C-alpha cells in the first residue's frame, strides 16, 4: 500500500514516556497594588512541569530527559505509553547539556530504545522527533538532519512552531540519535529549528551520572563575559579580543591559584582565546584534576593551574534515599558537600560547608554513586563517616 | 501616537478633533461647540532609575470665524521620576484635589463642574510644584500620595495696581495666594478609596466688597470612592469647601457642599451608557442669598466606541436648577442641554 | 525519475475549491477622537472571508468547509480549480466541530473526492494538506499524522506558520482523511501544529446537515466554566472539582427540569465530572431527546432530565429559497423557530418566538431538510402551516 512511519513508531513508542514534575522554587514577594503603567525595578512557590523522556535501561528503569524539566523537582512522575504510571527519582543532571537522568521506582516490564552511533550522522539523513509539545500528549513530527554542528549539537527541522523542546530524536530505524533540547534557557521553546544532543554524547554523560553521581566536568571557576558588556566599557579594557573576567569564583582554582577580575584571558595552553564563548567551550573538553595554563592580560600576566569539578551539576535529596547539595571532590577522594541551606535539615545533622564523606556509613565512599549505593542497600542504621578536613565525626 | 522612540527618548504626539454641537434654550451655550486638542508627552531615560519628562496640552476652539482665535494652554510641566521613590514636576498642572475628584469626571461631555479651572488647587492652574510617591517606596502596591505647593498668581502688571501684582496676574476670580495641598488614594483590585485637602491664602483683590465670600483662606476637604472592574464603572465624591467654590460671577461661597456620582457600563459591542448626578449646595452666602443651589443636574448619556481612535456620543444635561433671582444675578445656566459629538483621536 | 506527490495531487485538485464569502455583522460604533494612550472599557459592517472547501457530492454539488469561513455569510462564492465560478448557498454548519456544508448553485461537471476511513489512521502515516494560507491561492503542504487524539481531533505537522487553518487533509492515495480546522476561535490561524476533524466524523456531521437541516446534538443548556473563574472565587465555592454553573439557560431543559447557578456538577450518569470541559464533551456524545441524570452540589442536590437540540447549530435565510433563525424541535416533531430579530422580515410574516411548522406549505415538515425540500420544489404559492403551540395559522 502506502509508505508509513507507523510501523517503526510502534516499535519505538513503548520506550518513550511522559514526565510530570511537581516542585517548588523561590520567587520574590509581590508588591501591591499593581500599576501596569509603572515599569518597576522570598517564598517558595509550587510549579508544574511536563516533558518527555526515553527509557535507556529496561532493567534499571533508567530514563533520559531534559534538565529543564526535572530541575527543582520535589516529585517526578512517569507514565509509560501503555498508560502504566510510576514514580521516579533523580539520579543525575547536567545544565550545560540540558540533559538529565532519572530512575523509575519499581519498574516492571519495560522497553528500552536502542541507541545508534551519532558519529555516523549525515545531513540529508531522515529524522523523527517525539515529544509533548503543548501538554496535550505525545506528538511525533518528521524531517531531516539539518546541520551537524561539527559541541556537535544536531540541528533538525523536525521541531514544532512555538512548542517546548521535546525529547527523542530517532532515525528511520527507530534508534536514538539525539535528545532534543532547549537553547532558550530558563524558558524551553525553540528558536525556529531543533537542537539535539547527539546520542553518543547522551550515552557518555548519562553513564557518568550513573557511575559517579555526576558528570566529571572541571570548571575554571571564573565568571564573566565578552568585551562588549557595560562593565568592559565602564571599566575601559585595553586590547579587546578575549574573555572578560568579571569575577573570580570563591574557593576556586582560579581564585586559589591566582587571578583577579579585569584580566582578559588571551589564550589557553598556547591557543588564542577570542571570546568567553570559545573559553567556556574549551574548558568543557577537560575532566577534573586536569591542568591548563592560560595567558591573562593586565599589563602582561600569565599562569598555570589545575581545575576541580564544576558546581552546576550537583546532587541534593537523592543521595540519601531519605530526604533533605553535595557533589564529587577531585578524583575518587570521597564526596565533598557544598553550600548548605537555611532549612538546615542536613546541616542539622552535623554537616558543615566543606565536609567530605569517605566512609560509606562504614565503608569506602570515593563517590556519590557508591555512597548512594549504600544509603539504598542498608536503610537501617546510618553513621556518616564524614571528615570535613580535620574533624572526623560520625553522625547518624 | 508615539512618533519617536530612539536612544532612550520617547515622544508621544496626541490630540483629537471633536465635532460638537449643543442644543439648548440657552442661546449662550447653544450652537457649534467644535474644538480640537493637541499635546505631547515626552520622556527621556537619564539612568536605569531616573527619568525626565515633560508634557504640554493645548486647546484650540474650532467654532469661531477666521478673524479670531480662542485657544489656551491646559497643562505645561517638566518633571523628574525616580524608580521606587517618587516624582517631582513644576508648571501648569492639575491641583492634587483632582486626584480624587477626577474619578467622577468621566461623562461624555458635561460633569466635573462643581469646581473649575484656575480655582485654587481644585483643577488646572499655574505654578504647581507637585511631589508624588507611588506604592510607598514600592512596598505597598496601590497606595499613592502627593503633596503640592502653589505660588501666588496675583493682579496683572502694567495696569496701575499698587499691591498684589505678579508677572502673570489676572482677574480676581482666577487669582490665588500661596497654597499647599495633599492627596492619598488606595486602589485594591477594582476598588478605590481616596481623600484630599487644600488650603490657599486668598488675595486682597479677592476680599473686596465687589465679591461675596470674603475670607482669609480657601479650604477644601474631599472624600471619594470608586469601583472599576467587570465592565462596570461606579464612582462618587463629596467635597466640603470654604471660600473656595465660585458662585458664577458673584464671587465665592462662604461654605459649599459638593457631591458627584456616576454609573457606567461597557457593552462588548462598543456602547457605554452613563448616568450621573451632580449638586453644589451653598450656605451663608451673604447679600440675603442665604442657602442656595449653585449647581444641580442629572446627566444621561452614551458613547459609542468604533475603536480606540473614533467615537460618537450624546449627552443630555437635565438641569434641575430653577430660574430665580440668585441664578440670574450669578449668571448660572438653568436650562437643559443636549450635546452630540463625533470624535477622531490619535 | 524522482518521486513526487504531483501525480496524485492531479487526481485530487479538481475536488478542492476556493471559497469567497461576503457578509456582514454587528460592530460597535467607534467613539472619537482616538487616544492611543488611553486603554478604554450598533451598525452592520461588511467583511470578506476566504477559505477552502472539498467537493463531497459531485451530483448535488455538496462542498464541505470550515464554519469559521461561511459563518454570517450573505453571499458565498466558489471557484473550481479549473477556474469555473459558481454561487453557493448554506445547507448546514456546526460551530463545535467548526465544520460547514454548502451547495454549489447549478453544478456542471464536478469531481468529488473519495473519503477514506478515519478509523484506520496511525501516527507515522503520511499526510498532505491543501488550503489557501494567505489568500494568494491554493497551497499544498506535506507531512505526517502526529497525534490521533484517541474527540479524535487529528494532529498533523502539515500546517503553516502564521497562516489560516486551511481545509483538506488527504492521505497518499488522494483520499480525504480530515478537514483542517481552527482551534483559535473567532480567529482562524494555528497554535503551531494542525488540527483536523477526522473524515469519518466529517461524513457523519455532514449527512445530518443534509437529511435534517442541522446536526442532532442535544445541549444541557447550562453555561458556565471551571472552578478557577473570578466568579467561583468571588462567590466562594465549596468542594472545588467539577463544572461551575454560572447560569442556567432560559427555556432550557436544565432550566425546565430544575437547576440554578452555583451548583457544581460532580457526575453525569454516575461518572465523575471534574471540569466543564469533561462535561461539555460528554454532553456532546448524546443526540437530542436523550436522558442523562447528573449529580449537582449545593449541600448535596441531584436530578435526572432529558435534553433538546442545541442552539449553536441553526439555520437562517436558507430554509425558504427566498430570504429573511429556526432549528429542529425534538424528534421528527416539526421545525421550531427561535429568537426572531429586529428587521423582522420573517416575524412580519406572522412568525413569533416559538412557532413550529409541521405543515409543508400543505404537507409534513417533521424537519428543516423536508421543509426546505418543499420551499425549493414549489416556489409558486406558499402557505406556512405553522402552529406555535396553539395558534394554527396559515401565513403566506
* Whole-angstrom distance, CA of residue A278 vs CA of residue A286: 14
- Method by which this entry was solved: cryo-EM
* Whole-angstrom distance, CA of residue B125 vs CA of residue B75: 8
Establish whether the linkage from the previous residue to C33 is cis, with ω within 30° of 0: yes
State how far residue A134 is from chain B, nearest Cα, in angstroms.
30
**DSSP string for residues in A229-269:** SHHHHTTT-SS-SSEEEEEEPTTSHHHHH---TT-EE-EET
Enumerate neighbours of C (3 or more CB pairs within 8 A).
A, B
Return phi, psi of residue A141, to 5°: -135, 150
C-alpha B291, offset from chain centre: 25
B56 at interface of A, judged by CB pairs closer than 8 A:
no
C171 at interface of A, judged by CB pairs closer than 8 A:
yes
Q: Are A274 and A241 in contact (CB under 8 A)?
A: yes
* Whole-angstrom distance, CA of residue A330 vs CA of residue C95: 65
Q: How many domains does chain B have?
A: 1
Q: Which CATH number belongs to the domain containing residue B304 in this structure?
A: 2.40.160.10
Q: Are B335 and B297 in contact (CB under 8 A)?
A: no
Within 8 A of C156 by CB-CB distance, chain A residues are none
The 3 state secondary structure assigned to C272-319 is ECCCHHHHHHHHHHCCCCCECCEECCCCCCEECCECEECCCCCCCCCC
Element (H, E) at A200: helix A199-212
Q: Which burial class, exposed, middle or buried, applies to A16 when counting CB atoms under 10 A from its CB (0-12, 13-18, 19+)?
A: buried
Residue of chain B whose Cα is closest to the Cα of A40: B83
Tell me the torsion sign for CA atoms C328, C330, C334, C340.
Answer: negative
C26, C29, C32 member nearest B345 (Cβ): C32
In chain B, what's the furthest Cα-to-Cα distance?
Answer: 65
Within 8 A of A31 by CB-CB distance, chain B residues are 135, 138-141
Which of C8, C38, C117, C123 would you mutate first to test chain A, the one with the most A CBs within 10 A? C123
Paired sense of beta strands B50-61 and C356-360, if any: unpaired
Q: Are B155 and B205 in contact (CB under 8 A)?
A: yes
Residues 6+ apart with CB under 8 A from C335: C213, C319, C326, C327, C328, C329, C356, C357, C358, C365, C367, C368, C371
* Contact call for A34 and B141, based on CB within 8 A: yes
Query: What's the helix, strand, coil split of chain A in %, to 5?
Result: 15, 35, 50
HSE at residue C66, side-chain half, CA atoms within 13 A, is 31
C125 at interface of A, judged by CB pairs closer than 8 A:
yes
Residues 6+ apart with CB under 8 A from C236: none
Paired sense of beta strands A176-181 and A168-170, if any: antiparallel
Q: Are A328 and A212 in contact (CB under 8 A)?
A: yes
Paired sense of beta strands A267-268 and A294-295, if any: antiparallel
Return phi, psi of residue B280, to 5°: -135, 115
> Helices then strands (H, E): number in chain C?
7, 25
Q: What is the resolution of this structure in A?
A: 28.0
Q: What is the CA radius of gyration of chain A?
A: 23
* Contact call for C32 and B346, based on CB within 8 A: no
Q: Are A184 and A127 in contact (CB under 8 A)?
A: no
C277 at interface of A, judged by CB pairs closer than 8 A:
no
Q: Which of B287, B144, B150, B133 is nearest to B210 (CA)?
A: B287
State how far residue B315 is from chain C, nearest Cα, in angstroms.
13
B135, B139, B186 member nearest A35 (Cβ): B135
Within 8 A of A128 by CB-CB distance, chain C residues are 124
B346 at interface of C, judged by CB pairs closer than 8 A:
yes
Within 8 A of C40 by CB-CB distance, chain B residues are 266, 305, 308
* Contact call for B269 and C42, based on CB within 8 A: yes
Which of A1, A10, A13, A137 would you mutate first to test chain C, the one with the most C CBs within 10 A? A137
Residue of chain A whose Cα is closest to the Cα of B185: A33
Kindly state the cell numbers that stand for B20: 460638537
Chain A contacts to B (CB-CB under 8 A): 30-35, 38, 40-41
Within 8 A of A32 by CB-CB distance, chain B residues are 140-142, 188
Kindly state the cell numbers that stand for C352: 413569533
* Contact call for C126 and A161, based on CB within 8 A: no
Give the three-class secondary structure for A100: strand
Enumerate neighbours of A (3 or more CB pairs within 8 A).
B, C
* Contact call for A34 and B134, based on CB within 8 A: no
Residues 6+ apart with CB under 8 A from C390: none
Range of the domain at B194: 1-346
Q: Which of B206, B278, B208 is nearest to B236 (CA)?
A: B278
Q: Which of C257, C220, C207 is nearest to C369 (CA)?
A: C207
Residues 6+ apart with CB under 8 A from B212: B247, B250, B251, B252, B253, B254, B285, B286, B287, B289
Q: Are A307 and A219 in contact (CB under 8 A)?
A: yes
B140 at interface of A, judged by CB pairs closer than 8 A:
yes
State how far residue C183 is from chain B, nearest Cα, in angstroms.
22
Catalytically annotated residues of A: 68, 98, 165
Alpha helices in C168-298 (DSSP H): 199-212, 230-233, 253-257, 276-282
Q: Are A318 and A91 in contact (CB under 8 A)?
A: yes
* Whole-angstrom distance, CA of residue A156 vs CA of residue B316: 66
Q: Are A209 and A215 in contact (CB under 8 A)?
A: yes
Within 8 A of B272 by CB-CB distance, chain C residues are 31
Write down the residue that cell numbers 510501523 correspond to.
A7
* Contact call for A4 and C157, based on CB within 8 A: no
Write down the residue that cell numbers 458664577 correspond to.
B248
B65 at interface of A, judged by CB pairs closer than 8 A:
no
Q: Are A244 and A231 in contact (CB under 8 A)?
A: yes
Q: Are C63 and C55 in contact (CB under 8 A)?
A: yes
Within 8 A of B139 by CB-CB distance, chain A residues are 31
Catalytically annotated residue among C15, C18, C98, C146: C98
* Whole-angstrom distance, CA of residue B193 vs CA of residue B100: 9
Q: Which of B337, B232, B310 is nearest to B274 (CA)?
A: B232
* Contact call for A5 and C123, based on CB within 8 A: yes
A42 is annotated as contributing to ligand binding: no
Q: How far is CA C211 from CA B117, C332, C334, C357, C366, in A?
A: 71, 12, 14, 17, 11
Q: How many residues make up chain B in this entry? A: 346
Amino acid at each position: 500500500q502506502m509508505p508509513s512511519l507507523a510501523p517503526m513508531l510502534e516499535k519505538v513508542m513503548p520506550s518513550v514516556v511522559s514526565i510530570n514534575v511537581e516542585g517548588s522554587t523561590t520567587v520574590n514577594t509581590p508588591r501591591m497594588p499593581r500599576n501596569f503603567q509603572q515599569f518597576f525595578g522570598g517564598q517558595q512557590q509550587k510549579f508544574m512541569a511536563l516533558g518527555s523522556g526515553v527509557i535507556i535501561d529496561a532493567d534499571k528503569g533508567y530514563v533520559v530527559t531534559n534538565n529543564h524539566v526535572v530541575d527543582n523537582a520535589t516529585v517526578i512522575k512517569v507514565q509509560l505509553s501503555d498508560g502504566r504510571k510510576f514514580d521516579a527519582k533523580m539520579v543525575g543532571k547536567d545544565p550545560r547539556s540540558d540533559i538529565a537522568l532519572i530512575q523509575i521506582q519499581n519498574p516492571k516490564n519495560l522497553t528500552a530504545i536502542k541507541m545508534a552511533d551519532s558519529d555516523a550522522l549525515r545531513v540529508g539523513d531522515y529524522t523523527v522527533a517525539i515529544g509533548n509539545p503543548f501538554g496535550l500528549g505525545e506528538t511525533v513530527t518528521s524531517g531531516i538532519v539539518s546541520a551537524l554542528g561539527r559541541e556537535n549539537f544536531i540541528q533538525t527541522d523536525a521541531a514544532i512552531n512555538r512548542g517546548n523542546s521535546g525529547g527523542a530524536l530517532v532515525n528511520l530505524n527507530g534508534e536514538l540519535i539525539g535528545i532534543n533540547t532547549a537553547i532558550l534557557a530558563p524558558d524551553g521553546g525553540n528558536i525556529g529549528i531543533g537542537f539535539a544532543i547527539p546520542s553518543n554524547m547522551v550515552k557518555n554523560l548519562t553513564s557518568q551520572m550513573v557511575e559517579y553521581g555526576q558528570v566529571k566536568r572541571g570548571e575554571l571557576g571564573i565568571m564573566g563575559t565578552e568585551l562588549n558588556s557595560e562593565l568592559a566599557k565602564a571599566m575601559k579594557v585595553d586590547a579587546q579580543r578575549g574573555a572578560f573576567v568579571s569575577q573570580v569564583l570563591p574557593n576556586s582554582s582560579a581564585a586559589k591559584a591566582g587571578i583577579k577580575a579585569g584580566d582578559v584571558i588571551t589564550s589557553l595552553n598556547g591557543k588564542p582565546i577570542s571570546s568567553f564563548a570559545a573559553l567556556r567551550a574549551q574548558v568543557g573538553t577537560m575532566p577534573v584534576g586536569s591542568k591548563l595554563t592560560l595567558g591573562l592580560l593586565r599589563d602582561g600576566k600569565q599562569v598555570n593551574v589545575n581545575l576541580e569539578l564544576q558546581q552546576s551539576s550537583q546532587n541534593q535529596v537523592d543521595s540519601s534515599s531519605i530526604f533533605n547539595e553535595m557533589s564529587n571532590k577531585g578524583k575518587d577522594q570521597g564526596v565533598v558537600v557544598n553550600n548548605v541551606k537555611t532549612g538546615t535539615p542536613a546541616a542539622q545533622i552535623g554537616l558543615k560547608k566543606g565536609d567530605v564523606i569517605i566512609g560509606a556509613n562504614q565503608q569506602a565512599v570515593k563517590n556519590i554513586a557508591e555512597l548512594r549505593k549504600v544509603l539504598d542497600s542498608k536503610p537501617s542504621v546510618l553513621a556518616l563517616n564524614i571528615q570535613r578536613g580535620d574533624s572526623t565525626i560520625y553522625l547518624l | 501616537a508615539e512618533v519617536y522612540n530612539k536612544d532612550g527618548n520617547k515622544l508621544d504626539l496626541y490630540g483629537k478633533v471633536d465635532g460638537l454641537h449643543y442644543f439648548s434654550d440657552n442661546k449662550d451655550v447653544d450652537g457649534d461647540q467644535t474644538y480640537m486638542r493637541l499635546g505631547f508627552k515626552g520622556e527621556t531615560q537619564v539612568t536605569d532609575q531616573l527619568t525626565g519628562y515633560g508634557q504640554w496640552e493645548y486647546q484650540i476652539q474650532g467654532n469661531s470665524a477666521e478673524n479670531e482665535n480662542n485657544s489656551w494652554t491646559r497643562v505645561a510641566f517638566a518633571g523628574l521620576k525616580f524608580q521606587d521613590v517618587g516624582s517631582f514636576d513644576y508648571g501648569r498642572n492639575y491641583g492634587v484635589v483632582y486626584d480624587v475628584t477626577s474619578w467622577t469626571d468621566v461623562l461624555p461631555e458635561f460633569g466635573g463642574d462643581t469646581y473649575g479651572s484656575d480655582n485654587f488647587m481644585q483643577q488646572r492652574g499655574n505654578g504647581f510644584a507637585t511631589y508624588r510617591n507611588t506604592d510607598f517606596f514600592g512596598l505597598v502596591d496601590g497606595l499613592n500620595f502627593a503633596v503640592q505647593y502653589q505660588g501666588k498668581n496675583g493682579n496683572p502688571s502694567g495696569e496701575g495696581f499698587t499691591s498684589g501684582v505678579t508677572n502673570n496676574g489676572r482677574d480676581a476670580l482666577r487669582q490665588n495666594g500661596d497654597g499647599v495641598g495633599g492627596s492619598i488614594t488606595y486602589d485594591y483590585e477594582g476598588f478605590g478609596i481616596g481623600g484630599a485637602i487644600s488650603s490657599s491664602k486668598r488675595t486682597d483683590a479677592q476680599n473686596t466688597a465687589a465679591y461675596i465670600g470674603n475670607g482669609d483662606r480657601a479650604e477644601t476637604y474631599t472624600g471619594g470612592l470608586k469601583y472599576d472592574a467587570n465592565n462596570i464603572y461606579l464612582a462618587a465624591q463629596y467635597t466640603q469647601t470654604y471660600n473656595a467654590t465660585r458662585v458664577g460671577s458673584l464671587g465665592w461661597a462662604n461654605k459649599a457642599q459638593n457631591f458627584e456620582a456616576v454609573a457606567q457600563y461597557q457593552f462588548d459591542f462598543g456602547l457605554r451608557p452613563s448616568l450621573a448626578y451632580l449638586q453644589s449646595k451653598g450656605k451663608n452666602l451673604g447679600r440675603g442669598y442665604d442657602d442656595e443651589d449653585i449647581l444641580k443636574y442629572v446627566d444621561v448619556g452614551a458613547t459609542y466606541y468604533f475603536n480606540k481612535n473614533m467615537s460618537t456620543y450624546v449627552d443630555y444635561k437635565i438641569n434641575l436648577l430653577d430660574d430665580n433671582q440668585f441664578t440670574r444675578d450669578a449668571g448660572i445656566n438653568t436650562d437643559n442641554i443636549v450635546a452630540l459629538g463625533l470624535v477622531y483621536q490619535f
